[PDB]
Each structure stands twice: as structure tokens, then as C-alpha cells.
Amino acid sequence: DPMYEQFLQRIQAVRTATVAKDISADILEARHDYFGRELCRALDIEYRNNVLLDEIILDVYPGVNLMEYNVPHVTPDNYIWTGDMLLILDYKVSVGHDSTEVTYKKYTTLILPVMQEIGINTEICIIRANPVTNQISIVGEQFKRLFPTIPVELNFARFFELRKMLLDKFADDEEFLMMIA
Numbered sequence: 001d002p003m004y005e006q007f008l009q010r011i012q013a014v015r016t017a018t019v020a021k022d023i024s025a026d027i028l029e030a031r032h033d034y035f036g037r038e039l040c041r042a043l044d045i046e047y048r049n050n051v052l053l054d055e056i057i058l059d060v061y062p063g064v065n066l067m068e069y070n071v072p073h074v075t076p077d078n079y080i081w082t083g084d085m086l087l088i089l090d091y092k093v094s095v096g097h098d099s100t101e102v103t104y105k106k107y108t109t110l111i112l113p114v115m116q117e118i119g120i121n122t123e124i125c126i127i128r129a130n131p132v133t134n135q136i137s138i139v140g141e142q143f144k145r146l147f148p149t150i151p152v153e154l155n156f157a158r159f160f161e162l163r164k165m166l167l168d169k170f171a172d173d174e175e176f177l178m179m180i181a
């Protein structure tokens with residue numbers, strides 16, 4: 001697993017809180033992308049990770065004149081264009097709901113208004129994995145309808161192992177315990 005080994009090498013060598021903070025953030029981003037790949041694989045949908053909203057619009061509505069609209073340049077993780085409906089997808093890996101709420105608010109208020117002007121029926125979907133319990137929580141009524149079961153096989157233990165080693169290595173470093181938390 002060259003992903004695990006790459007983090008381990010960085011954790012072995014890191015000496016400063018700033019480089020350590022970046023490793024921690026990279027591990028959190030990596031387990032996020034791991035969940036997205038596994039989810040898209042299980043649902044046999046196309047795997048994407050951050051698509052510019054303008055690019056989504058051009059895929060679903062090639063004839064659009066971009067310059068006719070105020071398109072926020074957000075990059076949701078992924079999308080599903082059924083031909084009648086656009087599900088905007090964002091992955092989350094978290095034990096809590098705050099990150100979901102924050103992103104739900106953002107994409108609801110920024111994406112829906114312009115998609116209604118353009119005329120594309122859209123739903124904001126956030127799929128969260130709890131990295132401790134592996135349970136999946138979905139917001140998006142149309143998504144649940146399309147995918148009533150999510151047969152993922154998730155294992156977040158290696159991400160926990162790596163990040164724990166990093167936190168252990170900097171447990172007596174005041175600068176670090178500030179930056180991560």
C-alpha cells in the first residue's frame with residue numbers, strides 16, 4: 001500500500017509542527033478521497049473529486065451561454081446527471097454533522113439559484129461516512145431513492161494508525177497541538 005507507506009515515511013522524518021500539521025491535513029484529505037472512491041465503486045457511478053460548477057453545467061447543458069449567468073466557481077466532489085435530474089454529490093468522513101451542515105448550506109444557497117435560472121433540476125446530496133463506526137448518512141431524497149442500499153466495505157483503521165503516530169510524536173509540542181485542533 002504505497003499510500004500508507006508514503007505517509008509513514010513522512011511521519012518518520014517530520015521534525016516541525018508546520019510540516020506535521022500538513023501531514024495531518026493530508027491524512028484527513030486522503031481518507032476522504034478513499035471514501036469517495038469506495039462509494040463510487042459500490043454504486044458503479046463515475047468517480048470524480050472536485051468538479052468546477054461551470055464544467056458540470058457544460059456537461060449537462062452543452063448549449064448554455066456561461067456568460068449569461070453568475071456561476072459561483074465552487075467545486076463539489078462529484079455529480080450524477082441522470083438526463084432528467086442533476087444530483088450534486090459531496091463526500092464527507094466525520095463522526096459528527098457540522099461539516100455536513102456547513103457544506104449543505106453552502107451548496108444549497110450557491111448552486112440551486114443558478115441551476116433554477118438555467119433550468120436544470122438539481123438536488124444537493126451529501127454522503128457522510130462515520131470513520132469509527134463505518135455507518136453511512138445521506139442527505140438527498142433523490143439519491144436515497146436511486147441507491148436504497150450502499151454495499152461499501154470500508155476500513156479506516158490505517159488512517160487512524162498513521163494520524164495517531166503523528167499526534168503521539170508531537171504530544172509535547174504546544175505549537176502543534178494548537179495548529180491541528
Ligand SMILES: COC(=O)/C(O)=C/C(=O)C1(Cc2ccc(Cl)cc2)CCN(Cc2cccc(Br)c2)CC1
Nearest residue numbers: 028029032033050073074075077090091092093103
Ligand atoms: C469533504 O468536503 C470537503 O471538505 C471537501 O471535498 C473539500 C475539498 O474538496 C478541498 C480539499 C479537502 C480538504 C480536506 C478534506 Cl478532509 C477533504 C478535501 C478542496 C476545496 N476546498 C474548497 C475550496 C477551496 C478553494 C477554492 C474553492 Br472554489 C473551493 C476545500 C478543501
Ligand SMILES: [Cl-]
Nearest residue numbers: 014015016019
Ligand atoms: Cl520537518
Ligand SMILES: [Cl-]
Nearest residue numbers: 073074075076
Ligand atoms: Cl466548493
Ligand SMILES: [Mn+2]
Nearest residue numbers: 049050076077
Ligand atoms: Mn472536494
Ligand SMILES: [Mn+2]
Nearest residue numbers: 077090091092
Ligand atoms: Mn467532500
